[PDB]
Design a protein around this ligand. Structure first.
Ligand SMILES: CCCCCCCCCCCCCCCCCC(=O)OC[C@H](COP(=O)([O-])OCC(O)COP(=O)([O-])OC[C@@H](COC(=O)CCCCCCCCCCCCCCCCC)OC(=O)CCCCCCCCCCCCCCCCC)OC(=O)CCCCCCCCCCCCCCCCC
Ligand SMILES: COC1=C(OC)C(=O)C(C/C=C(/C)CC/C=C(/C)CC/C=C(/C)CC/C=C(\C)CC/C=C(\C)CC/C=C(\C)CC/C=C(/C)CC/C=C(/C)CC/C=C(/C)CCC=C(C)C)=C(C)C1=O
Ligand SMILES: CCCCCCCCCCCCCCCCC[C@@H](O)O[C@H](CO[C@H](O)CCCCCCCCCCCCCCC)COP(=O)(O)OCC[N+](C)(C)C
Ligand SMILES: CCCCCCCCCCCCCCCCC[C@@H](O)O[C@H](CO[C@H](O)CCCCCCCCCCCCCCC)COP(=O)(O)OCC[N+](C)(C)C
Ligand SMILES: CCCCCCCCCCCCCCCCC[C@@H](O)O[C@H](CO[C@H](O)CCCCCCCCCCCCCCC)COP(=O)(O)OCC[N+](C)(C)C
Ligand SMILES: CCCCCCCC/C=C\CCCCCCCC(=O)OC[C@H](COP(=O)(O)OCCN)OC(=O)CCCCCCC/C=C\CCCCCCCC
Ligand SMILES: CCCCCCCC/C=C\CCCCCCCC(=O)OC[C@H](COP(=O)(O)OCCN)OC(=O)CCCCCCC/C=C\CCCCCCCC
Ligand SMILES: CCCCCCCC/C=C\CCCCCCCC(=O)OC[C@H](COP(=O)(O)OCCN)OC(=O)CCCCCCC/C=C\CCCCCCCC
Ligand SMILES: CCCCCCCC/C=C\CCCCCCCC(=O)O[C@H](COC(=O)CCCCCCC/C=C/CCCCCCCC)COP(=O)(O)OCCN
Ligand SMILES: CCCCCCCCCCC1=C(C)C(=O)C(OC)=C(OC)C1=O
Ligand code: SF4
Lengths: 115, 156, 83, 175, 98, 105, 318, 70, 71
């Protein structure tokens, strides 16, 4: 209940700042002023053209390594179990495979950007 | 009247805010830009007056034409001048920008940047000293202090 | 003997970060199996009363079950006080 | 009855699903999926699943950032489409909105078996349990049980993650 | 049932229809797959929380992990398709017929 | 099709997670633990065909605990009659059902 | 009365950001043998007010090629999330007391990047697009290492509750137990707030203005306020996480003062770092995070899982 | 100065003092002056609800001692 | 003590609901007052709707979302 009110207040303040910024000052908009900026000149092509990503392989690995965090964040609660040997074995086992997955992609030139 | 006093005080506030925060575009052309750099140097420290360079024209308030404006360059200067949101000011620095200067009779040189954009302050010299440019900037501040936009609107 | 020594010297010269990472990981893997306090950690986890201890119905044949919390029978946490 | 907050959150969930299912430009699709993930996090929070809702929000934020990068890399067009820039996308969006409206109306104003079974509404508060005990969160305990009860699950999950890394590297090799 | 259950089920149905109906971009369909997974996560979490089944609180996490695996697989395939054709359109994938 | 390696080796790879009455952490019970316990013990060892018929009562109780459809129907009927009675003014709610009760610990 | 507390939180934060701009200008001036703003008011105390008034009385412009809805939404999201990041911080009592405050801050921080991404894309300009892609790269670089560092540090706390960190550090600072993790976390927060030497998204020398190049006036000012508020919030979070101030339940003002001085010192440390170093290349940042920070982070995660078990020092409150 | 940087730092410190002090004062003012109760778990919430019920004025912080047992 | 008080409060709420239901459902021809929906005769933990069905919205909010929303 309180968090919804806080979020509403923050969003309302930001929107009101936008409204003040957009309705208080004098506006003189013409085509030259609103045109796209490339430091002195008209752009050759469109900004919506395909923009190559040279780190595309690391981007896919980030997806798999981000879910490693989901499996590891309950660890503080897992340390309170009675069978500490089993939990420690499985926690260490999970990180070892994460370390081995990083080592595999490193040694097979997966961390280097496309040329 | 009460409204006259209110609009006068509002003009005072807005003019103070605008002249106390003057952001020139990161924009220079020739020899003059070196003296602009030296006016940004620790000896004069324009940042202590509230004057900060910003690269984007959208985020800049002043353009300092510091150097020769050639024909090939004039459309680019006009473009970056136009993209500046208002209120905007232009300061012409050096003989080349003021009237063409030492390349006045050249085939490829614009004979003064006032043929392309309106100019508020003309700073003479070849190049003007960093102190002279600081004087021109303070003169521009004093000119901004004299604006009466809201008084004019109220008297309409 | 000397081959591994030279390999470790080269690794320390070129990749100290990886050397430190492998040393820390190996220590974290092996040290817990040699520690005498791991059993103490297990016992501390066991000694935390999360839920209510349900009493047992007395039938006259439980000499090792207390009839009151302050009776000498049952587990003792004296070891925990001095730990 | 009581403030129907979860009803509004689930309606916004369905609205975002319609938004990214009408399939505008993947930028707007990812925006709709982010909105859906946030409102689903709120829904799960309203039933006591703080960890699960927050975790799914975090995971989908990371996934949608990767998806935005990939959309700019390989899924762009000269004029990216919005929900009102195309007859097909707008028609799909309107059809989804009105289908959800019809389902909701027929659900709360009378009792009908839509596809599986029927329901009257009454808000979510009715089916609660009013259980009163504990110095812990049962969700947290159940999730932490993965490292003591779910050894098999941890093994298969870790193997699948390592194999997934190997698989993406095998696929993106080329030649 | 609660009406939230119907809302989540219709979210799944809408995402399934969105996947089954294809526009030009391959990427849009991957987003529909991710939406189906999100709806499955929400529904399973609600069912598990309502019945207080403690041990399946970890099941949606496994669901999320294999969702990430699916998304990585789809993105890799999209990379190869776009490298082949310069575009992620589905109509380019017509070399094989029935 | 189904090679029961777990039963042959006594491993319990995933049987700890199949049912709601099976050894939850910290002994936290399921909301329908007793109904499922009764239904499981009714149907144990008699086969699936008989379990459906001779144990339909326990399964019906378990499903009612799970989804609470009949309870919601009864509550809806009671509240509809209550609203109908108030709208004509024949019935008045008691003070303890209007927010003026005397609370107890 | 709760809205009074919300306002008493948000408004002083905005004032602190406004004067942090001046503190930055003066500190970087004095490290550069100059003075910085000292004319607009005594010692330049009126400079932020003049800057704000100038920015909000200047004309905002919509680019012709821009996508209007996302263009307007992005600064709103940035500022609202920057304000929202402060509600779970215990100083020593939080406005919103959460069981999972750290992970909530993680999720909100992850959501904050979309303001930069969407502003860059909706500007429909090449430099803004380059800035947005650099932001994608930066998040891919730092996210996993930052989260695992939080996990390893909080393993000694016993939960994800921010107020428990005060009790955990009643006798000693957590830094004396996890200083390598503290250094890596400090660098990760430098990268996370897009601050030098990792100020890649704006990229002023290379990309002119980067993601916010199209923005002018009031919308631009909100991006600036969001960035500076995020800097202050991150430094305050670091102070709570690694420098535990002693809290007296009958005198919380002492804790408040100690907290404020520590977070000010950390903010000045950021300012010093900006004044001291050149800029990374944005592939070098990812190589640093994935080849040096990630292996040590994994090893120290293993070590910090094993250590409480080895020494029988597992914290309470499952 | 270098000590002319101090006034801005002092203003920023004064601004940063306000949130925590105001939060503490508001908690004390709205919780009987005794440090607003923390309910991280259901047992603490049950204690708070019982305290509210037995207060007689629908306020948990109104505490009844041994003078309420005649 | 908490368990005993919980038992008494739950039983009192159920008894009050039963008496109000007896008053309300008198005109229905084939309605049994207090009829269970389960074949079993053992005690069943009351559902949330059963305890607070005939009460104000504020009490229902406090019972359902009171702890979750408390921050
Ligand atoms: C049920 C229906 C759902 C209601 C939708 C909500 C309201 C949005 C509709 C208004 C925006 C469109 C206006 C417009 O086109 O130009 C305005 C107008 C016209 O400009 P123009 O140059 O003449 O013409 C432009 C072209 O027509 C076209 O120019 P364009 O390229 O900009 O067109 C794109 C635009 C056009 O819109 C459409 O195509 C149709 C509108 C349907 C959109 C619904 C799709 C579902 C998306 C996900 C669900 C979101 C929640 C919806 C449910 C509501 C309940 C909350 O689509 C959008 O971008 C709208 C996106 C809204 C989502 C914002 C949420 C923020 C996410 C933050 C993180 C989330 C955290 C987790 C939670 O210009 C202005 O007036 C200035 C800008 C005003 C915009 C204000 C801010 C945008 C609205 C706020 C969103 C609501 C947030 C709560
Ligand atoms: C190497 O050069 C450079 C510098 O060095 C000189 C810089 O400083 C620098 C940083 C930019 C500076 C010029 C600082 C600019 C100051 C801000 C833009 C002003 C922001 C202040 C307001 C918007 C905050 C709001 C104002 C209120 C008073 C706060 C309270 C809010 C109410 C609701 C109450 C840059 C980019 C730079 O390039
Ligand atoms: C810091 C956070 C808190 C902020 C609190 C203040 C929030 C302010 C929000 C922004 C509003 C203030 C902006 C400035 C004043 C408003 C002026 C403008 O927005 O309204 C005009 C509204 O004009 C309307 O188009 C027509 C006017 C008549 C409208 C009739 C509506 C009903 C009136 C009925 C008359 C009888 C009285 C009814 C009211 C009681 C349109 O202005 P326009 O010229 O485009 O814009 C140029 C702006 N300039 C001139 C100031 C530079
Ligand atoms: C509260 C939130 C909403 C309002 C937002 C704005 C916040 C309030 C604005 C703060 C006002 C402070 C500005 C005053 C500073 C003036 C300093 C002084 O120097 O000004 C002199 C005279 O003052 C100016 O003429 C006018 C300044 C005051 C303007 C009138 C006050 C209006 C206040 C009305 C408040 C209403 C706000 C909007 C409400 C919606 C001119 O001297 P100057 O040339 O520079 O210096 C020469 C340089 N030397 C010394 C090195 C040689
Ligand atoms: C027949 C051929 C065998 C070898 C090949 C088999 C291929 C499959 C891989 C391994 C088989 C899985 C068997 C392990 C099942 C886990 C359950 C069993 O081991 O008991 C556990 C014992 O824990 C052990 O430590 C299991 C961990 C050992 C496995 C980790 C490394 C081996 C995996 C190697 C293959 C995986 C992919 C490749 C990785 C290199 C838990 O017992 P405990 O906790 O007391 O009590 C639980 C009941 N509670 C909850 C009420 C308390
Ligand atoms: C978050 C930090 C800042 C917070 C935002 C609030 C800032 C408050 C500053 C108020 C200063 C007063 C504003 C004055 C400038 C307004 C814009 C402007 O200059 O327009 C001048 C314009 C020129 O028009 P003309 O002469 O007819 O046409 C000439 C061109 N053909 O004249 C006007 O429109 C004047 C209108 C009066 C302005 C209203 C000011 C009232 C104060 C509102 C403040 C809002 C607080 C929130
Ligand atoms: C946006 C992302 C939403 C995430 C909100 C997380 C807030 C939070 O964590 O607070 C938790 C708090 C308490 O949890 P505990 O830690 O267990 O402590 C109390 C128990 N004693 O939970 C709550 O208060 C739940 C309150 C309702 C959830 C809010 C849902 C927000 C969803 C955002 C939707 C946006 C509006 C709809 C349209 C969106 C786009 C147009
Ligand atoms: C003052 C009178 C108020 C009128 C409001 C009209 C708004 C409007 O659409 O107008 C466009 C207006 C001004 O443009 P012009 O018409 O060209 O110039 C006006 C001067 N003649 O532009 C704006 O200011 C738009 C401002 C946005 C409105 C606020 C609503 C946006 C809501 C954002 C929701 C997203 C939240 C994201 C974060 C939350 C996630 C937890
Ligand atoms: C048993 C412990 C296991 C668990 C702990 C470890 C957890 C995290 C650590 C593992 C993370 C994965 C690391 C993967 C290593 C990749 C190696 C590699 O190929 O990198 C080489 C470089 O590294 C090498 O030199 C190859 C291997 C060298 C040895 C590395 C350490 C091996 C073990 C050393 C210490 C052994 C244990 C410590 C004992 C200390 C002695 C008392 C290439 O370098 P580039 O970045 O591509 O060059 C670009 C610019 N030229
Ligand atoms: C931050 C240090 C102050 C920089 C001041 C901005 C300089 C703007 C002039 C542009 C310019 C630059 C940058 C420059 O480097 C240079 O030398 C090659 C010029 O020739 C004179 C220039 O004109
Ligand atoms: S005015 Fe003189 S110093 Fe300035 S650019 Fe021209 S020639 Fe060079």
């Amino acid at each position: 209940m309180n968090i919804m009110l806080t979020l509403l207040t923050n969003v309302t303040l930001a929107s009101l700042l936008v409204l003040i910024a957009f309705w208080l000052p004098q506006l003189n908009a013409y085509s030259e002023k609103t045109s796209p900026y490339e430091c002195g000149f008209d752009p050759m092509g469109s900004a919506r053209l395909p923009f190559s990503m040279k780190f595309f392989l690391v981007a896919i690995t980030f997806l798999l390594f981000d879910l490693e965090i989901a499996l590891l964040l309950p660890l503080p609660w897992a340390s309170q179990t009675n069978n500490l040997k089993t939990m420690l074995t499985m926690a260490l086992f999970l990180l070892i495979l994460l370390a081995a997955s990083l080592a595999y992609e490193w040694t097979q030139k997966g961390l280097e950007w496309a040329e | 009247s009460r409204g006259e006093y209110v609009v006068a005080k509002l003009d005072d506030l807005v003019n103070w805010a605008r002249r106390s925060s003057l952001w020139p575009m990161t924009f220079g052309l020739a020899c003059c830009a070196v003296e602009m750099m030296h006016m940004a140097a620790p000896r004069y420290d324009m940042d202590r007056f509230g004057v900060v360079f910003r690269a984007s024209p959208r985020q800049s308030d002043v353009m300092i034409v510091a150097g020769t404006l050639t024909n090939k360059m004039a459309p680019a200067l006009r473009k970056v001048y136009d993209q500046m949101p208002e209120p905007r000011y232009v300061v012409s620095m050096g003989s080349c920008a003021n009237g063409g200067g030492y390349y006045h009779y050249s085939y490829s040189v614009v004979r003064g940047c006032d043929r392309i954009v309106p100019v508020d302050i003309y700073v003479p010299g070849c190049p003007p000293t960093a102190e002279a440019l600081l004087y021109g900037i303070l003169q521009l501040q004093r000119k901004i202090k004299r604006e009466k936009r809201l008084r004019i609107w109220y008297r309409r | 003997a000397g081959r591994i020594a030279s390999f470790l010297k080269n690794a320390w010269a070129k990749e100290p970060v990886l050397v430190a990472s492998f040393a820390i990981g190996g220590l974290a893997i092996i040290l817990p199996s040699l520690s005498p306090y791991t059993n103490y950690a297990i016992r501390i986890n066991r000694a935390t009363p999360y839920n209510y201890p349900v009493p047992l119905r007395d039938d006259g044949n439980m000499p090792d079950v207390p009839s009151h919390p302050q009776d000498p029978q049952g587990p003792s946490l004296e070891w925990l006080k001095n730990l | 009855m009581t403030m129907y907050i979860a009803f509004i959150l689930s309606t916004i969930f369905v609205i975002g699903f319609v938004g990214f299912s009408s399939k505008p430009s993947p930028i707007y699709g990812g925006l709709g999926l982010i909105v859906s993930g946030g409102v689903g996090c709120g829904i799960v929070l309203n039933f006591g699943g703080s960890f699960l809702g927050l975790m799914v929000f975090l995971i989908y934020l990371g996934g949608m950032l990767v998806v935005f990068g990939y959309t700019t890399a390989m899924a762009t067009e000269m004029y990216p489409e919005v929900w009102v820039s195309n007859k097909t996308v707008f028609g799909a969006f309107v059809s989804g909105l009105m289908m959800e409206f019809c389902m909701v109306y027929y659900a709360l104003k009378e009792e009908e078996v839509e596809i599986i079974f029927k329901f009257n509404g009454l808000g979510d508060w009715v089916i609660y349990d009013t259980g009163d005990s504990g110095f812990f969160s049962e969700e947290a305990m159940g999730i932490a049980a993965l490292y003591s009860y779910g050894t098999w699950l941890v093994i298969v999950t870790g193997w699948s993650l390592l194999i997934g890394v190997v698989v993406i590297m095998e696929i993106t090799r080329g030649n | 049932m609660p009406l939230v259950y119907m809302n989540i089920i219709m979210a799944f149905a809408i995402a399934l229809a969105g996947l089954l109906m294809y526009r030009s971009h391959l990427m849009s369909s991957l987003l529909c797959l991710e939406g189906m997974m999100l709806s499955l996560f929400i529904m399973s979490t609600l069912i598990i929380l309502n019945t207080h089944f403690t041990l399946a609180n970890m099941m949606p996490i496994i669901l999320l992990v294999f969702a990430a695996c699916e998304a990585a697989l789809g993105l890799s395939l999209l990379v190869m398709v776009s490298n082949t054709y310069g575009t992620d359109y589905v109509q380019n994938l017509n070399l094989l017929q029935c | 099709p189904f090679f029961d390696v777990q039963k042959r080796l006594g491993l319990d790879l995933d049987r700890w997670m199949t049912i709601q009455s099976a050894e939850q952490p910290h002994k936290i019970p399921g909301r329908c633990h007793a109904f499922e316990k009764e239904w499981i013990e009714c149907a144990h060892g008699i086969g699936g065909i008989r379990a459906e018929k001779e144990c339909k009562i326990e399964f019906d109780d378990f499903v009612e605990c799970l989804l609470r459809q009949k309870t919601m129907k009864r509550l809806s009927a009671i509240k509809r009659q209550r609203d109908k009675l108030i709208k004509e003014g024949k019935y008045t709610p008691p003070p303890h059902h209007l927010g003026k009760e005397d609370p107890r610990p | 009365m709760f809205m009074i507390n919300i306002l008493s939180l948000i408004i002083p934060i905005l004032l602190a950001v406004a004067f942090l701009t001046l503190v930055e200008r003066k500190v970087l001036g004095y490290m550069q043998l100059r003075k910085g703003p000292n004319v607009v008011g005594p010692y330049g105390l009126l400079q932020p007010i003049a800057d704000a008034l100038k920015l909000f009385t200047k004309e905002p412009l919509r680019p012709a090629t821009s996508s209007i809805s996302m263009f307007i939404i992005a600064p709103i999201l940035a500022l609202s999330l920057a304000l929202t990041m402060w509600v779970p911080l215990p100083m020593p009592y939080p406005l919103i007391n959460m069981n999972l405050g750290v992970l909530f801050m993680l999720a909100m921080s992850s959501l904050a990047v979309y303001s930069i991404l969407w502003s860059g894309w909706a500007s429909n300009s090449k430099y803004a697009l380059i800035g947005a892609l650099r932001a994608v790269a930066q998040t891919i670089s730092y996210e996993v290492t930052l989260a695992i560092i939080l996990l390893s540090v909080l393993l000694m706390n016993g939960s994800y509750t921010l107020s428990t960190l005060i009790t955990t550090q009643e006798h000693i600072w957590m830094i004396f137990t996890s200083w390598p993790l503290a250094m890596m976390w400090f660098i990760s927060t430098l990268a996370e707030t897009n601050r030098a030497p990792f100020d890649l998204t704006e990229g002023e020398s290379e990309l002119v203005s980067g993601f916010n190049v199209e923005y002018a006036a009031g919308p631009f000012a909100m991006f600036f306020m969001a960035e500076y508020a995020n800097i202050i919030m991150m430094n305050a979070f670091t102070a709570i996480l690694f420098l535990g101030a002693s809290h007296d339940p009958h005198t919380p003002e002492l804790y408040t003062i100690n907290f404020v001085l520590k977070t000010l010192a950390l903010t000045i440390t950021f300012l010093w770092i900006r004044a001291s170093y050149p800029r990374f290349r944005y592939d070098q940042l990812m190589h640093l995070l994935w080849k040096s920070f990630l292996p040590l982070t994994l090893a120290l995660c293993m070590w910090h899982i094993s250590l409480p078990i080895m020494t029988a020092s597992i914290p309470p409150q499952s | 100065m270098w000590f002319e940087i101090l006034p801005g730092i002092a203003v920023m410190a004064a601004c940063l003092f306000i949130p925590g002090m105001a939060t503490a004062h508001i908690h004390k003012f709205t919780n009987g002056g005794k440090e607003k109760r923390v309910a991280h778990f259901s047992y603490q919430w049950n204690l708070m609800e019982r305290d509210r019920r037995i207060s007689g004025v629908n306020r948990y912080h109104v505490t009844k001692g041994l003078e309420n047992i005649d | 003590l908490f368990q005993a008080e919980k038992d008494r409060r739950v039983l009192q709420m159920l008894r009050e609901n039963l008496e109000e239901e007896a008053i309300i459902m008198k005109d229905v021809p084939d309605w049994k007052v207090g009829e269970s929906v389960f074949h079993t005769t053992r005690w069943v933990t009351p559902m949330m709707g059963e305890l607070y069905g005939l009460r104000t919205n504020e009490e229902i909010l406090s019972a359902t979302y009171g702890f979750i929303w408390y921050t």
